[model samples]
Target: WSWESYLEEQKAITAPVSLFQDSQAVTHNKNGFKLGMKLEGIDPQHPSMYFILTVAEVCGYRLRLHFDGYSECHDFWVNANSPDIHPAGWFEKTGHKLQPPKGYKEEEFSWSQYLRSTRAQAAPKHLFVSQSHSPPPLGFQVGMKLEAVDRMAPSLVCVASVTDVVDSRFLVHFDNWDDTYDYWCDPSSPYIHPVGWCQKQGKPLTPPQDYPDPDNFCWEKYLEETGASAVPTWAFKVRPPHSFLVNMKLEAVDRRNPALIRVASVEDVEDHRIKIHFDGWSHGYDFWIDADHPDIHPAGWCSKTGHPLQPPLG
Candidate 1:
């Protein structure tokens, strides 16, 4: 209901080292590419091949580019100035052949016909920055409060806490949202900022009702009042060893739709926990769950409870 209420309930709020860290600069301006403008970019699906692309959408400094003739599934996001993208005819002039989109044979693609039909308006060089500033060192600690972008509702920034830290990345738990959407990102991710960044940049930050009074609130007393487990420095202490083997089918509550219990499987197991992957859903919906956690049901638990089980996504 409010920041204080959320912190009291969620318990853990403290709150990648990849090339794309280039999009995190606080001062970078929006990329001026427009919809329908054609460019050349590497095919993420076929990383070794280059293909024609069209700017389908723009958000801040990111562009959603669609492979010229590929299905929507091939669309992807890239920073405005990512090295993967280049001006029209870049592949050709560089002595590299451009591959046609999937489902189209190379012999069927006519360069002359493509050029005549599409407007190849490359985003001007002046519109892009050669590089972005490295994000400042992460001086944050677990349970520290900060503001973060709500990936589900990308336009809003919400109060968040640092739940876990692994290597150069940190996990952000939204004030009141379930852990399902909590994500791992490098300190340089554009989606995160210090407490005052949104305000200084004139961007609106969404609050979870109202701010909490630190002087009046006590973490220990709140845990006792709510009968919640006291959070410790290593909250993930009850970790699982690699046990659940991949394809071991079970049932689990859907993180996105908590009420729905669906058939899932152990897609992978890490030192910390086993990945509860839904039968038919993409890896995006998969999440890690402790082996002993009650949320997961044995192979026949759902059948015993008479709970309906969803068949694996085909």
Candidate 2:
């Protein structure tokens, strides 16, 4: 059965949002680390060791870190405020010795020299919030309408429905779109807002796709027509910015010319989507996708598929 239909059959209580404690912070929001930014943290498999690491990915309040001299297989997750993470010289100040990459030893290492040599830019402090508040409990009925970020379009806030609830999260399905645009997130996720949130923010809410008779539309009447019920009291929060930077290379399918696999770079990151520009194409041929879309592969994807790679626009 589809997730929605199966949810109806089980009617399980939504999971508690608090079940997952962000070990990195008392409360968690965006931690501000960018790809390649360096820091010091405890090695997950060997807690006795502390090593320099790079921020590889940012997802909500969590960061995926890669050990500076290690392979991707050694990457791990930590909250933004986790005590394990600290500035570059954190080990010396705390009386702990910094562990070098797998093949290196502290005896041959010059911590001072290494610090000076590798020092450059660190993640900006402003990217982190002073404090994060616990998300209020989620309470909602199926079929209720609300405003949600269009993942495919990222910047567009469009009409959506609470198609199903499981644990502390709910399924958000865009009105008039297929299930592909649907996703599940906590009720407090910044991407979700109350029915009138867009109006209050003075942001225009896109009407449901293929909505009939816009001139005669009445919010109350429509809810009644869909047998929608009131969700519990709550307010919307702010969504996080796109994590990828411009010019960062990636692999993407050529929608206009789908038969070809192409090298691509991030040209723009809108609140609604990441604009992907094909290497050899003009802006007119660019397309957009959510930051987490699976179709946009890592840099070497074309090589793995044995597909001819397209070079960037010269």
User: Model 1 over residues 1-314: C-alpha lDDT tens digits?
Assistant: 13234335535121011201123222234457888777776565444356888888765445678887768777777655465566665555455567876656767766556666563555554543321122322454456556677865564877666764433345677766666557655454555666555667887666543436543444345444444442222222222243456665556667665446676667787653678877668989888775544356554434444445666565
Worst 10 residues of 2 by lDDT: 16-25
RMSD of 2: 20.0
CA lDDT, every prediction?
0.57, 0.61
lDDT of 2 by residue, 210-278 (tens): 788754555567677787754544534444654566766666666755445466777887764678887
- TM-score for each predicted model, relative to the true structure: 0.35, 0.40
Which candidate number maximizes lDDT? 2
User: Which ten contiguous residues of candidate 1 have the minimum total lDDT?
Assistant: 12-21
Reference-based lDDT, residue 308, model 2:
54
